[PDB]
Design a protein around this ligand. Structure first.
Ligand code: DMA
Length: 300
């Protein structure tokens, strides 16, 4: 009743988020959750909302909640500012999402929150554009321009999203992984070895060949790529590769969703740290179809 029986969608979401966190042992703050939901709870109920767990080595699972919607303006910024979730840090991140929306028209935006912290990222989603359109953005890390030849070499020509991480002080460029070389396990070996990142098992490599989206993370403190991530979606619980990792298995089987038959998005992250898995449940069933659609792929 307070947390069960008839209840608003938003209260159902809150309860489910806390349940996930408790089940996976993630930390959270009641004050932060409340602050997030006061500002964003209506968005979570009506748009493409997801709950994520991720499993960094030698630390607790983290639980994040996120959403995206097809609006051309960055509606999250005002909401986060007014909620007390986004204070200036005296840093390039402070104006970066604003610069992104000035430089490249968006067809959607989103935001992401760690329930033990607050707002972590805001996302900008344009139509797919040449990656060179990003070089207009004043406050991007210098490392981005320096990787022009790397992007060309690995067929990272088609930019499909941008994000600003206010917590980590980093930015990600996301690419539509359209090129047939990206359907080969050798591509993933090569791109990882180019950054001296560890190469995963053959089993994981055979999963990566279906990845429609590649993120690359840059920061202002170093000249190199901080980490990269390969995203793969699965249309239901059973098709998630549960045997690869116990968090994948548990989350596919037990993650809550309002829709009876949800899909999932899995991010395989690699770094030098940086190597872990992220898994999101498609809580209302809107995210996975949208993901395939944004990458010009038929729905599997
Ligand atoms: C496909 C998709 C929804 C990507 C969002 O970026 P992310 O949350 O995985 O970024 P990061 O984990 O680098 O903060």
């Amino acid at each position: 009743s307070a947390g069960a029986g008839a209840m608003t969608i938003v209260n159902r979401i809150r309860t489910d988020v806390v349940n996930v966190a408790k089940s996976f042992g993630a930390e959270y703050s009641e004050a932060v959750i409340d602050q997030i939901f006061q500002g964003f709870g209506e968005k979570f109920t009506n748009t493409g909302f997801a709950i994520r767990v991720q499993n960094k080595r030698n630390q607790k699972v983290d639980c994040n909640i996120r959403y995206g919607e097809a609006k051309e303006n960055c509606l999250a910024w005002d909401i986060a500012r007014e909620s007390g979730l986004l204070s200036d840090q005296g840093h390039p991140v402070d104006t970066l999402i604003q610069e992104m929306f000035q430089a490249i028209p968006a067809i959607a935006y989103g935001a992401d929150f760690d329930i033990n912290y607050g707002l972590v990222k805001i996302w900008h989603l344009p139509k797919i554009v040449p990656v060179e359109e990003a070089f207009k953005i004043p406050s991007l890390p210098k490392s981005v321009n320096a990787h022009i030849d790397f992007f060309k070499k690995y067929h990272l020509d088609a930019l499909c999203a941008l994000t600003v991480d206010y917590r980590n002080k980093s930015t990600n460029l996301y690419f539509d992984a359209h090129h047939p070389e990206q359907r080969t396990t050798q591509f993933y070996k090569n791109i990882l070895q180019s950054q001296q990142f560890e190469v995963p098992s053959d089993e994981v490599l055979e999963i990566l060949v279906n990845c429609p989206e590649i993120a690359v993370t840059f920061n202002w403190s170093s000249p190199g790529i901080e980490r990269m991530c390969f995203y793969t979606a699965f249309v239901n619980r059973e098709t998630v590769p549960q045997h690869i990792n116990p968090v994948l298995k548990k989350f596919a089987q037990e993650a809550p969703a309002l829709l009876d038959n949800p899909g999932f998005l899995v991010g395989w992250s690699f770094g030098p740290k940086g190597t872990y898995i992220k898994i999101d449940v498609d809580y209302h069933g809107l995210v996975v179809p949208s993901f395939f659609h944004m990458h010009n792929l038929p729905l599997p």
